[PDB]
């Protein structure tokens, strides 16, 4: 019914139940107690699309693809400013350098790329310098980032990182159940702090850092616990755009 | 004493095995389910919390109770973190200090700095948790705020104007911290889902689906106002007056549930009343009346000086105590010497304490020299004490109200707990929402049936009067089938009588298929309900005035007890036959005499072994004959041989049947004393008047429905200067008795020494333990939460052959419809206490719940004036067409005296206790403009008789 | 013929598990919004309270509180579609119709959707159940041409 | 145990004969010298007070402990009113409610609303005595204030910057309610007269005769910091 926060397992099964999609706390897991208090297995489509293949074609085959920890094939969705967009299904270990400079050419505009955002708006902004970073959960989660549903957009040099860092919080604000404070108020205050940063204030950046940290460590779900990542990444990777 | 009382612990208390954990260097042992926060609380180590309360289940909104745990990544919340063995937690690390500071910063960035000019200063949980963490600066220059009336460039669209619609509390959202302790409480505790969170995110605002609280589905219980930390939802008495300093534990003067309150006091001025989180009757919950309606004590209409008349036609005379008592005693002695001691009588009040009741029954027995005493019990729940006496041996309840927590089925005959006993209905719904099943045998759709998130439910919408036919059919169903417990019967009950009972009930004439014609309930539904009741492991019967107040009340109660005995739903938590007592201390009044056939302790008056003890203790010769009952009193007075009467805390005119006859009998009475707070309907025929005392100025006890003895404390000072027991002893000594009581402790000691059960009762006990069930002797010192746990009281239950007899109040051509009389949540029985409050909003006029199809033919429309042409009188009332009632049935209310409803009521009554037939009366509802010939005369009399000089 | 439609809808969704959301979808699809005169019957037939039925309607964005215009124009505002110039399309289009983002009217209603799946086709829009991609500054001409 | 420990009584305890008096319907027996306020405290009936402490002798500054006494004209102060035999006093009449409201109004008209972000939140005697009396509005649109850093047309001449010279306590006069429980304590209890009231009237400000506390004749005993109700000395 038009809510990005209903993708969370708890909020999802809360929306299924006929109520409003407010994220629940997690003393009980949905597995133990979920839909109508009864155990429920809640999974993504890509995970429930490989199950048949896995059980039929042999699990030992599906384990062949991937790195040491991550095993299997993943689709990489490539959109935004990019010549050859679409979908690339392949095994982990591939560098986004190859995926973004060789496979899918460059940009549609013909300009270079300044940003490559893995994951949705809950994902860091990986620049050209990170082209030597292969696609796997552990290494990306280690190198200050996130790889989820393999989302991958592209931005060229004519993009403003300030606008995007602001959009991040604007999103976290418009998309928010309102259960816990660090997203209720945190986001709509960060959206102001970013404007202040745009103005030129110096008492905003450390303020922003503290806000982001409390958001990370306090927010109930990841919509307000990973929202800081876009911001901090755009700030530490592209400082030539943030006065 | 327990900490759950003084201290607000974080989360609800759980049942489980002992788990040991270390909270910030302090060893702790708590059940497994118990959270980290509650354990830390129990350990003395307090962790900051704003959105977590004991009343409701924890939610991760505040993020202020974060704690660093070894083995867990990040800073998890204690409220939503269940304890584990050997867990070492760190409450206050530097990082956590910083994070909590940040969160409070984000709060206060959207909060007005109206501290120091706000209602909840010193009683706000945001202010102390903002000072606790140590917030020293807010760095967020906020442009988007909810409180700012005027934003840049103009009005703030977020700003929502205050709501003062409800006369008892106000909703200022400008200060709302969305935590939803209002929503959670209204939904989990009260059970009426009238509050929600409209919006998504920062735009989220608490709101009822209506313009104002009053127009919504809010019953005014104040559980949101009690659980709101930040003055958003606030009592108006705290706005007008300052925040209170001290607290005193008292109880409600209503409903017989005995909700234990703490009055918050600022000097002597009662600021507010808030539940105590004590008493198994209410675990921190209440309703409109007890919570808010306490302003009758501070009303201008209250009478504060004695008044003597010498003739009803003559005006009053404000007078001191001495000569008032002198005149009273003189007239009394005259009438006594002339017509005898049996020409007197008293009418005790349940509304009063049990000490005062004891003094009054003494005054009637020792002093006057008669057994002519009585009480409200005689029009309500007197048949109960006959039935449960004939069957079990105790004229009282069988279980507490915590038992319902363990029930698995609830069978409700003739009750409406959503109005009558709201705090019981709350804990009922708490279970109904948790799977338990429900059967409702009322002829009128009750709001308990339409509760939200309800499980299964059956509704036997029968015809008023046929209440024993249905029970008999249930029994026939259970006996023709074989579902009953034979082990239970063979162990706790008798078999030889059971065989006869079964051979009788097994007749195919008392079957559900034959009663459908006279009863009106379907057969299949009835069979299903019976099977469901019999099959369930722990079922429980709750009954009220739909069984007792009829031509056959004791019979119905006996049938119900037969059911409960047969099925095996006795002697265990979750099962029992509970009558829902009404007024406070009805149980205590009945226990302390208040009956013309017994002494304190349900001991008959003809008992020589008892009369001896009492003559020995009082040093006076008593009578062995049972006394008259109110109907008998009035019939006599009409016939003569009855001249005096001392009405204590009762309205014998408005709150009794056949207003005409009772008035005629109250008039032919040389002396009728009145001892109420206000000038009443009964005081229109009075010759004397003695002021009284409220429960705030009193000191003593109340014995509620579950046999619980709650303690009543003095918070104010008597405005008349004397409490009710003081006035009673005044009168008694003025007549010649010679009592000397300076405190009700001596009185309770007397009671203990005289009757058993209260033998171990002492105010110290009541203070320490808090509450006691009156069956408390040297055996069972702590109390008896459950009765008949080990064999019945008489020794063996008794199965009685109940049968359905056609009522004499059948309907005919000129009286086709039927009638019923009931209640509302806002107003109390006669509303002498409640009409003098702001509860005239929800109910300011009594109305007639007629059926639509029974309205079209007559020409009635909602809001029209109609007349109730009955046999025993006539009245006029404002109509209300509703599909709530069945066709050929009507429902009135008696809260307001402007409409004389009990003039329609007939003299027909029960056979044993003569409890009137309030719930059946053949009427005729027609359309009319002129109110009446009776109401006019009543108004005239009341006007010409309530004049003071 | 409102009560009739509503009763039919509720009968169609009788006995389901968590049937509030579907019932509300169907209601919105029928009329165009969730009328306040239909908060009570739903609650009754489902055993809920007006409050919850209102909260559910409030939380979710797809449930209109008032009707839209004869036409509707949803326009992504997410990262990808932003990348390839959604702002320009937005400006052009809102100048064409004269209605800013979120600003509705009786003619049209311009709003955000934040994704349509047309991420590769970065500039993406939803005009009256018709998806459109690669919305250059020329396609807007046809967008408005078929859209008076 | 004694109440002098847990509860801050109004005035110092006196030696004398037993005197019986009725405080708001409560019988009380206290030495002759003992004041009305201390007796009311001993009786459980609390009367609002801000400038009276047990450590020092009472002064009639706050005017918040006013009580209506039979036989006395007007509303005299309990702190400066010695008990007399048979005296019947009324702690809370309507008029007194009104007057106390007015006085707290006049206070808060010159006080910053830094509650909720101040050091003495929950331990301030101005806040609880402002909530106790029941202040709900301030009708004085003040232009002359001590706390306002910037006044109309520029800097406030009354504003005195904070003093953090002493490593143990700080003096923020912006929140001072002149009551002089600091002066009184430093002079009567400690015995080193290092604090005074510089100025006459509204311009009166607490001060030591020196730029900062450290340079003065202050030995750091914290008897001012203990007796300061309003976080000025904290
Ligand atoms: N049509 C119809 N009539 C009915 C009934 C029905 O169901 N339908 N129910 C019957 C039953 S259930 C009963 S309980 C009665 C109840 O109704 P009543 O027996 O009339 O008792 P109350 O409503 O308390 O008011 C009676 C008077 O006592 C005064 N009083 C209250 N508290 C005190 C106190 O603490 N001290 C003193 N000295 N006086 C006090 C009240 O202010 C009031 O003036 O009504 C009966 N009449
Ligand atoms: N707010 C509030 N609380 C109260 C009171 C009040 O007036 N206001 N009254 C107090 C008093 S003293 C009383 S006694 C108690 C008890 O109060 P309850 O036990 O709740 O009794 P009532 O509400 O009078 O009505 C009982 C229900 O059964 C229905 N009924 C009618 N005839 C029959 C019949 O023949 N068979 C069956 N099975 N049902 C029938 C009635 O219509 C009604 O709905 O509550 C106390 N609490
Ligand atoms: S971070 Fe935001 S969306 Fe997530 S649970 Fe908290 S309030 Fe809801
Ligand atoms: S609710 Fe509490 S924090 Fe908010 S203004 Fe009132 S007293 Fe201050
Ligand atoms: S007063 Fe009671 S019923 Fe009304 S909103 Fe508050 S909690 Fe709910
Ligand atoms: S009204 Fe009170 S309890 Fe409800 S969300 Fe707001 S602050 Fe919390
Ligand atoms: S009327 Fe009954 S439920 Fe309400 S507060 Fe009094 S005792 Fe409790
Ligand atoms: S001193 Fe007291 S009243 Fe003044 S700002 Fe601090 S806490 Fe508030
Ligand atoms: S700390 Fe200094 S100024 Fe304060 S009372 Fe002690 S000596 Fe006086
Ligand atoms: S510094 Fe403190 S004690 Fe001294 S006058 Fe000011 S408020 Fe009173
Ligand atoms: S403090 Fe436990 S979550 Fe609110
Ligand atoms: S992001 Fe706009 S198309 Fe998916
Ligand atoms: S209160 Fe006694 S004078 Fe300050
Ligand atoms: Mo009753
Ligand atoms: S009663």
Numbering used by the authors:
A (entry chain B): 251 to 493
B (entry chain A): 7 to 955
C (entry chain G): 2 to 149
D (entry chain E): 7 to 240
Quote the authors verbatim.
One of these oxidoreductases, the metal-containing formate dehydrogenase, catalyses the following redox reaction: 1 CO2+2e−+H+⇌HCOO−,E∘,=−420mV In standard state, the equilibrium of the reaction favours formate oxidation at the active site Mo or W atom, which is energetically coupled to the reduction of oxidised nicotinamide adenine dinucleotide (NAD+) in cytoplasmic FDHs e.g. from Rhodobacter capsulatus and Cupriavidus necator. The RcFDH complex forms a 360 kDa dimer of FdsABGD heterotetramers. Subunit FdsA binds the bis-MGD cofactor, which coordinates the Mo atom in the active site together with the conserved Cys386 residue. The direct electron transfer chain between bis-MGD and FMN of the heterotetramer measures 76 Å and consists of five Fe-S clusters: A1, A2, A3, A5 and B6.
To solve the structure of the functional RcFDH complex, we subjected the as isolated, azide inhibited sample to cryo-electron microscopy (cryo-EM) and single particle analysis. The bis-MGD containing active site of as isolated RcFDH structurally resembles that of oxidised FdhF. The EM map around molybdenum indicates six ligands coordinated in a trigonal prism geometry. The rectangular base of the prism is formed by the two dithiolene groups of the bis-MGD molecule coordinating molybdenum from one side. The two remaining coordination sites are occupied by the Cys386 sulphur and a small ligand that is oriented towards Val592. There is no clear evidence for stochiometric binding of azide in any particular location of the EM map. Two tunnels can be identified in RcFDH starting at the molybdenum and separating at the active site residue Arg587 into different exits. The two Cys121 residues are located directly at the dimer interface and lie within good disulphide-bonding distance, but the EM map suggests they are essentially coordinated to their corresponding cluster.
